[PDB]
Design a protein around this nucleic acid. Structure first.
Ligand SMILES: Nc1ccn([C@@H]2O[C@H](COP(=O)(O)OP(=O)(O)OP(=O)(O)O)[C@@H](O)[C@H]2O)c(=O)n1
Ligand SMILES: Nc1ccn([C@@H]2O[C@H](COP(=O)(O)OP(=O)(O)OP(=O)(O)O)[C@@H](O)[C@H]2O)c(=O)n1
Ligand SMILES: [Ca+2]
Lengths: 441, 437
RNA sequence: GGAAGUAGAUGGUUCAAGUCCAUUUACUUCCACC
RNA sequence: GGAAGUAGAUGGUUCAAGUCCAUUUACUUCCACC
């Protein structure tokens, strides 16, 4: 099991075969023919145009180049026009920057409008750097595509490929820069082993330095962090995987792992072994794009976790899942049930003015003195984390994300017990509690 | 009803009737006759020697003055022999300083050996300051020394009289000094409201300055605090009580409240409504004096209390009770049961060597990363506060006071729920939980 | 949409809030959907 | 007996202990038992 023999096998998992390549060549040809004939300035960009796309992930990126004088309104009207004009069938769905997603001869295509700039300074739209990224990489990546494909494959198999909010990992463009920076997959992995949260990679300068955060300097624009949306945790996982890969190299690192169907009965056993409170907030999925929905689920998850922690339910971890129709916020707490009384701190016996109004209150028990200050016994209006959340989410829905919070206003319920183990959340449940052997292929 | 109308009606319960005084005089004489028969220099000090004892607190303090020639060990043997051959029956039991306690013609007596000195500063034993104390008070407390007996009665009714550990309150002498410093109990009550914990009262200089701590400076030794054993919380209680009295006066402030007997059934009801975990540590009371016991019971109570908090059972309060044959450490926690799993913080991801060690320990569940560490799920040995204290007391008996600890070491049990309300701890549980009716 | 920051405001909880729970106006950034 | 203080010496827990849990030696000051 030699390292180089491992990577040679890995190639068969990440290099697309002849039939896929040809399928994309045939599509490419058709697209060009349609876009000429339309007049229209365009440019193929991204992994297709650089032959760095992953086996089974063929998708062509076309960028339409407009006069910078155009309004943003004019950009979308025209982008959508041409995109629609050029794709066999199509779909329009985006967060901020408009574009058309479609198919040309059975292959995924994205037609994206942008601005024909010269110098990626000042930037009129979010995506204006992409043509420049391509000019830059074009001649610096020839002969190193398979190398980029290994890294991509390695990341994806470990669930940290892509910088969208659903994954918060490594973009494809980031993979290319790393390969340009280190020369090979093997060199990257070897080096990544010693990246820190303060690591700055400046590709254009061929330099590694200490900064305020992890920062991969864009060759085309130095104020840009190519790794802006890679989370601290995903960086950590990557660094750790590299360490593990070099200790014990294996083809396992390039094969995806799938959730495994775990029976409700065994889940009941694990939860009662841990003796925790496990429950979810269930509600209708708001009909919005992933990049709007996921940060909103992140916020909702966080605020309720914070509520649980200030309310002394000792939350362990937290998870979320989105189905076609429902979303789920998963929670685990050390405390299944708290007492009803608690102590509220009072004023120091010194100043009477405050002590007077502190004792003026009607309570059931009778304040006392401890360490030179008054304290009182007060009652909770809930004693289980479920009851707690039910109070929280009914009362604070507006702080849980624009659309997520709105959906919770109109309907939510709290599921625990067997009722929760038959929901499609077992993968997230297992992940959350760190159940061993979960997890396969 | 009004200002000084109440003080009249109280003086009935503080000043002793003539026939209690008459029993005590016929006991005083008999004592002089026995001591002089033996020769022996003797000074009378304390409350009886100043006419400041409560109606029922009849005790006589006698001090034996030994020449300094006799050493610390010679002192006590002769002081004991004298005390034994001067009291009808006698009891010897003390914490550090030797004395005989006994009865003459049916009257409580204390015989305490000490030294005769010129100059108070630079003590030999411990009580040497006391004759000096008295000779500073003989001509200063003269007159309406009933302003003391009201102050005493006040503090006694409210559970904060004596300055011994069981109480941690106001010394008898501390009372007589304040009456000299302010002029009268009422005037003392007026001022005590303004007292902080920074208050320093200098009877000698008439100086109400603000030092680092509550310090009643002794007229006989300025290095020494007369209030040195009154606790912070006990001070708080008085300062408040005075405020409560000043505004709305009542004779109730001089009557001791009946200790309040609540039935087991009502207590269980209170506790179940409270939703807490209430349990006690019961063990055999070690055969020691109060002043060695109570601080140990406190220890003890505190160390287990801290165990409970660092163990996330969120304790509310604690208390303790001493009986004939048993002691009880009383606890109430907000958490009746905790989960088996908990999180353990590991290292930051960069620190590759310590990550290896951390990840190499066998656990039931896969560790995880969160904000750049490395955390692990671990399993607890216990899930209930009672379960928890059973362990801590078993392993940490030695940190729980010399004797209390030794006693816990050989045996204790944990009493909770139904079994507990049958033990003599209900008054303590009521005070603890602030039960009110 | 989400996140950071700067300058105001409002409700609630509390003996007690610039600070805890929320709401809101103006502005400067940044990220994703490529 | 308990508490405060100064100089050390350990053992345990932990990825890691001058920081958490305990133990010990010497010098010191305090408190109650009056
Ligand atoms: N977060 C992102 C997303 C995209 N891009 C730019 O957009 C191009 C196209 O991105 P995308 O289609 O999302 O993926 P690819 O880079 O083409 O690679 P792959 O499809 O294999 O993920 C990239 O090359 C890059 O220049 C970027 O800079 N940062
Ligand atoms: N903590 C104390 C208590 C007592 N004493 C000295 O011991 C004398 C007698 O105190 P004690 O007999 O213990 O109580 P009484 O002063 O007699 O008060 P009472 O009779 O109400 O109990 C006091 O006058 C005082 O000089 C002292 O200095 N330190
Ligand atoms: Ca693409």
């Amino acid at each position: 099991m030699k390292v180089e023999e491992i990577l040679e096998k890995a190639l068969e998992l990440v290099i697309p075969d002849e039939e896929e390549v040809r399928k994309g060549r045939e599509a490419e040809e058709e697209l060009r023919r349609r876009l000429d004939e339309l007049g229209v300035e365009y440019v193929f960009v991204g992994s297709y145009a650089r032959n760095t796309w992953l086996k089974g992930s063929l998708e062509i990126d076309v960028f339409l180049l407009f006069p910078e004088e155009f309004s943003k309104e004019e950009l979308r009207e025209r982008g959508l026009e041409i995109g629609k004009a050029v794709l066999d069938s199509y779909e329009i769905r985006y967060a901020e920057h408009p574009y058309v997603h479609g198919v040309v001869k059975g292959v995924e295509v994205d037609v994206v409008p942008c601005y024909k700039l010269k110098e990626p300074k000042n930037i009129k739209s979010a995506v204006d750097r992409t043509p420049f990224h391509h000019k830059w990489l074009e001649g610096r990546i020839k002969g190193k595509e398979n190398e980029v494909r290994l890294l991509k494959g390695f990341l994806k198999a470990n669930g940290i490929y892509g910088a969208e909010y659903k994954v918060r990992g490594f973009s494809g463009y980031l993979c290319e820069l790393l390969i340009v920076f280190y020369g090979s997959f093997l060199e990257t992995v070897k080096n990544a082993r010693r990246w820190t949260r303060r690591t700055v990679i400046d590709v254009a300068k061929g330099e590694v330095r200490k900064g305020e955060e992890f920062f991969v300097v864009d060759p085309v624009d130095e104020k840009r962090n190519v790794a802006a949306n890679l989370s601290l945790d995903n960086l950590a996982r990557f660094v750790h995987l590299c360490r593990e890969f070099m200790e014990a190299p294996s083809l396992g690192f390039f094969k995806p792992k799938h959730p495994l169907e775990i029976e409700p009965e065994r889940l009941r056993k694990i939860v009662e072994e841990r003796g925790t409170a496990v429950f979810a907030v269930k509600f209708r999925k708001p009909d919005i794009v992933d990049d709007n929905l996921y940060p909103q689920l992140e916020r909702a998850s966080r605020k309720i976790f914070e509520f649980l922690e200030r309310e002394n339910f000792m939350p362990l971890r937290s998870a979320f899942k989105a189905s076609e129709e429902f979303c789920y916020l998963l929670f685990e707490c050390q405390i299944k049930e708290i007492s009803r009384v608690f102590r509220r701190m009072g004023p120091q016996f010194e100043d009477e003015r405050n002590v007077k109004k502190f004792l003026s209150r009607n309570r059931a028990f009778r304040p006392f003195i401890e360490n030179g200050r008054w304290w009182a016994f007060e009652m909770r209006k809930f004693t289980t984390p479920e009851e707690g959340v039910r109070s929280y989410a009914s009362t604070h829905w507006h702080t849980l994300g624009k659309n997520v919070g709105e959906s919770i206003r109109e309907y939510f319920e709290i599921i625990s017990g067997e009722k929760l183990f038959k929901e499609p959340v077992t993968a997230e449940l297992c992940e959350m509690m760190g159940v061993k052997d979960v997890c396969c292929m």
